[PDB]
């Protein structure tokens, strides 16, 4: 499966778990598959068929924008990290 890391601030939607399992070949399939278990999260991640400008997604630490965006390839065993833009100190 594809192990997906949730950031603290979004764990509201994943019943407070810092990680979820999933299946899919593109980034967008991995999102849809997580939405099906944990409603509401996809709304935070995509806007008008595109990743939110203030959201970053990595596949094994590679920024997906350089590699297809929503259409970037996901193999089985890949780690997918969600990393939102946040208020800094």
């Amino acid at each position: 499966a594809v192990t997906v890391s949730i950031p603290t601030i979004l764990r509201t939607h994943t019943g407070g778990e810092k990680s979820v399992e999933a299946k899919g070949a593109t980034v967008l399939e991995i999102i849809d598959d997580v939405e099906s278990r944990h409603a509401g999260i996809k709304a935070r991640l995509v806007k008008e068929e595109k990743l939110h400008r203030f959201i970053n997604v990595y596949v094994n630490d590679e920024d997906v924008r350089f590699s297809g965006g929503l259409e970037a390839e996901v193999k089985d065993g890949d780690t997918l990290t969600i990393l939102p833009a946040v208020a800094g100190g």
């Binding site: 603290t8 601030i9 970053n56 833009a85 208020a87």
Partner: protein
């Protein structure tokens, strides 16, 4: 007032900068930045989930973010390598050209050497830097010579409220450094701002002081006023103290 720093087209006018990673209320942030007269918005990423600081998604709806200069910070990072990574994520993802560069270990204290190493790397790719340092003359000269736009210099430990621990060292440094110096760290109240400015500081960065005042909004307003009072005082050439 005049701008105390210009990086390209971006002008820094407000003499108080405000860090915003500790608030959990979007209206309050909006209101503090307003009260403080801030014109800089500070943005980052939190790979290790050190905090639950507000999402830009949620801030963009309720604040006029286009009225602020956006700068990145690497202050959640705990290694030099992680800071550089965060700096380059902020560049790629938001087009950040101006970085508030922080390399601290697990002691929440700037690492001077490591910071200088990170500055050489980032300057080499044209990033504009405001690095945070302890008040070391040698360190401050190296960063100036590397083309840093301003230096941030530590008054006292983070969240200590102790004000300025070694004022003479900060005076001595500001005298020797041509570029602007922002005083930052441990600032507890408005009197500390005015003290910072009377040492020759161009601006001050406050954070915990606003988060932990009984009335954040009033302290924000007080520090705005303290910065201008502080500046005027400095320019008026105050009397030397008559001591032993």
């Amino acid at each position: 007032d005049e701008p105390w720093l210009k990086i390209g087209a971006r002008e820094f006018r407000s003499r108080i900068l405000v860090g915003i990673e500790q608030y959990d209320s979007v209206p309050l942030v909006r209101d503090v930045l307003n009260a403080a007269g801030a014109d800089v918005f500070i943005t980052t990423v939190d790979p290790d989930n050190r905090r639950s600081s507000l999402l830009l998604m949620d801030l963009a709806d309720e604040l006029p973010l286009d009225d602020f200069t956006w700068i990145g910070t690497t202050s959640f990072a705990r290694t030099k390598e992680s800071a550089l990574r965060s700096a380059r994520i902020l560049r790629d993802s938001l087009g950040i050209e101006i970085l508030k560069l922080d390399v601290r270990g697990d002691d929440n204290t700037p690492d001077n050497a490591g910071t200088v190493e990170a500055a050489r790397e980032l300057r080499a790719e044209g990033m504009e830097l405001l690095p945070f340092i302890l008040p070391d003359l040698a360190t401050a000269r190296a960063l100036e010579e590397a083309g840093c736009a301003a230096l941030r210099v530590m008054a006292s430990p983070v969240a200590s409220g102790r004000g300025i621990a070694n004022p003479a060292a900060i005076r001595e440094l500001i005298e020797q450094i041509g570029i602007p110096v922002v005083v930052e760290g441990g600032i507890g109240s408005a009197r500390h701002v005015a003290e910072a400015m009377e040492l020759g500081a161009s601006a001050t960065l406050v954070n915990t002081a606003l988060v932990r005042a009984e009335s954040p909004l009033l302290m924000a307003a007080a520090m705005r006023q303290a910065a201008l009072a502080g500046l005027l005082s400095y320019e008026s050439g105050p009397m030397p103290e008559v001591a032993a």
